[PDB]
Design a protein around this ligand. Structure first.
Ligand SMILES: CC1(C)[C@H](C(=O)O)N2C(=O)[C@@H](NC(=O)Cc3ccccc3)[C@H]2[S@H]1O
Ligand SMILES: [Ca+2]
Lengths: 207, 557
């Protein structure tokens, strides 16, 4: 019925969730994750929110400061508060399922707690929607879609203009870090289409 | 990260085939997580990083999907104008505006906590401040405000049953990511998804813009601008972090370039070799590309040209003949530790010497060290990710192309000398370096092979397991951390879709309190090593016929 969640694991241990509504589907997914990967997920949580030094010590202070300086958690929170009830059920159901298994782990730690918890000296706490969202935000967004070296580029262009002069410096910057290179192999062939925009390639924002 | 999608006109015994090899580095326990979700509108199977709600790699019985890193430029830095009179403010549209800020305290196990402040402007968080020039740099992301919409788009897209329903969700994914589509009718497609800023005219995206107001983004470009293709005339879609489309600009990272030397060409050669590919031949592309030295193809011509007048006994010449006779494919010797051919070490030492003499020498210190890498640098744990053509080698490839290259050589990297002389001098260094280490008999040179390591620290450098859980594989393979293949409308089966994957070391990371590891803690590790794969089930009858265990819960929200 509405409350029922069936979990089936195949011969490689891969879980298949059966449920009738969004909250219950994602609850089963969070539950099985908590069974298979609790310590990895706890540690990915601390990595994405910069709370590693809390359990691992001083060698991780700088890293935790660099994670917190790279995002604005309240903004993520405000995005979660704007979700429709169906969308919020994906993240709530997932946090609640995990919490169901974590609650069983801390009630019978002697047989259920991942050994790593005992090695690193701490026990897992429950999760909320924000934490599930940050696993994604802190990896995919704040790490895999966040790359810029513009301040270093400008320091390179500065040294290039100091070594070769203004014009040659800028043309040498365009030889080392071209904006576009027409001989690049493209996933979409030129006959299908080409990107219609043309960009400035002489730093004219400061001209 | 790579991907090849083979549509109807290129597939054999099937209407479409998608093979994905997302490269995030290798970890213990597994970077990705296998999961099947059935109900509430979903019917999907696959695996996905960190068990996100949305599966990044998988299919729903009608369509399949996958991703590779986009590397579009969706990030710019704004130089904010500060004032020593009004600390904590910056000038924007003619007014001194107050910075947003927040305090954070880092708690420290067995140490003292530290408190610090994070500042943010209308353009994003402050990265660094130069109090000497009263300038603060804020990092502006085009996807800012859409991170949660992106997770949701990657989850709702798993319900799409055709190209139009799927691109409606591709359109809401704001990060810079290449998404791929294949379906039971043999249609294939690609979209370089994400949010890209509409910049003011005059704005060079590789360098910082004034944050005082006139250089603010006008908004975001529309989805119509995102590079995309559906059922391309070539019959296939291939990507290995290369450019999406002619005239599309790469990420502004100085060490990242899309140029005539691109490792995606190694996939093209294999797909174009034969008129059509079966699913086994398409899966076999993983094995070949994972062992393919990427510089051979680029530099062998220049090496053959520079040595073509030399006598048979010249060693410069004998190094290039050894390369000429090789297809670039590395294979271990029986020791499990050296490669059968010495070609990669020859190319590494030659290339290192060529960059030092050319690009390195044209760039002022300390920036010269950005162009000195040959691309073969590794630890004894082996490469931490994919291997690529280095940034300096891509620049040297333009120079050695002469006026075949569209990039004006503002500075002659060969500084007035004949290129042949520089190539031959680098070859002289290579002979000297390598013959000193291994002897003068090239055929018995047993150069060290790179190895592969499933690290116990996640990609951030943080423990996600004890250090003894690290796993080790003899053969480094330049392939996905996971590999998945979906076949659509196979002629050898009545099923609309067949699909396979490999998630090593295993599905489970659990180790009991007494040290007893799960039964699924390491049962995909050998499969990974041997290019094997296991079936991904979707239907209730397949799942139940391969069932190992089951649990039924009764829960009230
Ligand atoms: C900029 C990076 C830190 C790094 C680099 O070149 O420095 N890249 C990868 O390895 C490549 N990563 C991937 O392709 C992994 C991926 C990401 C998104 C979707 C699929 C695969 C990019 S980011 O990591
Ligand atoms: Ca930029």
């Amino acid at each position: 019925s509405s409350s029922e969640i069936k979990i089936v694991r195949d011969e490689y241990g891969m879980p298949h969730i059966y449920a009738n509504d969004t909250w219950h589907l994602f609850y089963g997914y969070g539950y099985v994750v908590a069974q298979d990967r609790l310590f990895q997920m706890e540690m990915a949580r601390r990595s994405t929110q910069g709370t590693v030094a809390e359990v691992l010590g001083k060698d991780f202070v700088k890293f935790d400061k660099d994670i917190r300086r790279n995002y604005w958690p309240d903004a993520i929170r405000a995005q979660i508060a704007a979700l429709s009830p169906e969308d919020m059920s994906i993240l709530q159901g997932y946090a609640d399922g995990m919490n169901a298994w974590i609650d069983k782990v801390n009630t019978n730690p002697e047989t259920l707690l991942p050994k790593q918890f005992n090695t690193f000296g701490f026990t897992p706490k429950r999760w909320e929607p924000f934490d599930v969202a940050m696993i994604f935000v802190g990896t995919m967004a704040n790490r895999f879609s966040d790359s810029t070296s513009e301040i270093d580029n400008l320091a390179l262009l500065t040294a290039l203009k100091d070594k070769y002069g203004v014009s040659q410096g800028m043309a040498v910057f365009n030889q080392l870090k071209w904006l576009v290179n027409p001989s690049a192999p493209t996933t979409i062939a030129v006959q299908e289409s080409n990107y219609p925009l043309k960009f400035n390639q002489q730093n004219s924002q400061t001209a | 990260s790579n991907m090849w999608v083979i549509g109807k006109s290129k597939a054999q015994d099937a209407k479409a085939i998608m093979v994905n090899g997302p490269q995030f580095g290798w970890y213990a326990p597994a970077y990705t997580y296998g999961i099947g979700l059935h109900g509430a509108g979903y019917d999907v199977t696959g695996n996905t990083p960190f068990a996100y709600p949305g599966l990044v790699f998988g299919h729903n019985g009608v369509i399949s999907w996958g991703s590779t890193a986009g590397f579009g430029d969706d990030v710019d830095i704004f130089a904010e104008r500060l004032s020593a009179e009004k600390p904590g403010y910056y000038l924007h549209n003619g007014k001194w505006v107050k910075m947003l800020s927040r305090e954070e305290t880092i708690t420290v196990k067995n140490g003292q906590a530290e408190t610090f402040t994070v500042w943010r402007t209308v353009h994003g968080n402050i990265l660094q401040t130069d109090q000497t020039t009263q300038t603060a740099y804020a990092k502006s992301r085009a996807w800012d405000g859409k991170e949660v919409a992106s997770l949701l788009a990657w989850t709702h897209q798993m319900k799409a049953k055709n190209w139009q329903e799927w691109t409606q969700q591709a359109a809401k994914q704001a990060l810079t990511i290449n998404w791929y589509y294949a379906d039971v009718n043999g249609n294939i497609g690609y979209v370089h998804t994400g949010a890209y800023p509409d910049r003011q005219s005059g704005h060079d995206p590789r360098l910082p813009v004034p944050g005082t107001g006139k250089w603010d983004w006008k908004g975001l470009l529309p989805f119509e601008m995102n590079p995309k293709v559906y059922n391309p005339q070539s019959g296939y879609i291939a990507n290995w972090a290369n450019s999406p489309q002619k005239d599309y600009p790469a990420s502004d990272l100085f060490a990242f370039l899309w140029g005539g030397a691109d490792r995606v060409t190694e996939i093209d050669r294999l797909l174009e070799q034969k008129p059509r590919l079966t699913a086994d031949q398409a899966w076999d592309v993983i094995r070949q590309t994972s062992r393919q030295d990427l510089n051979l193809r680029l530099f062998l011509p220049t090496l053959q040209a520079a040595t073509s007048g030399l006598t048979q006994s010249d060693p410069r010449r004998q190094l290039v003949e050894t390369l000429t006779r090789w297809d670039g494919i590395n294979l271990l010797n029986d020791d499990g530790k050296t490669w059968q051919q010495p070609g990669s070490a020859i190319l590494n030492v030659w290339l290192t010497s060529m960059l030092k003499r050319t690009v390195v020498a044209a760039v002022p210190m300390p920036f010269d060290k950005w162009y000195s890498a040959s691309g073969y640098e590794t630890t004894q744990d082996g490469p931490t990710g994919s291997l690529n053509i280095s940034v300096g080698a891509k620049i040297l490839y333009e120079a050695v192309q002469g006026d075949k290259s569209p990039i004006p050589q503002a500075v002659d990297l060969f500084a007035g000398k004949p290129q042949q002389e520089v190539v031959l001098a680098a070859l002289e260094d290579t002979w000297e370096t390598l013959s000193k280490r291994y002897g003068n008999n090239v055929s018995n040179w047993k150069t060290p092979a790179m190895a592969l390591t499933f690290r116990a620290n996640n990609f951030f450098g943080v423990p996600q397991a004890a250090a003894e859980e690290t796993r080790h594989q003899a053969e480094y393979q330049n392939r996905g951390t996971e590999n998945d293949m979906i076949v659509f409308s196979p002629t050898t089966s009545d099923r609309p879709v067949l699909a396979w994957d490999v998630v090593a070391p295993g599905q489970s990371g659990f180790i009991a309190p007494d040290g007893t590891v799960d039964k699924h803690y390491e049962d995909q590790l050998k499969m990974y090593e041997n290019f094997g794969r296991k079936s991904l089930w979707l239907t209730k009858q397949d799942v139940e016929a391969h069932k190992e265990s089951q649990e039924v819960l009764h829960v009230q929200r």
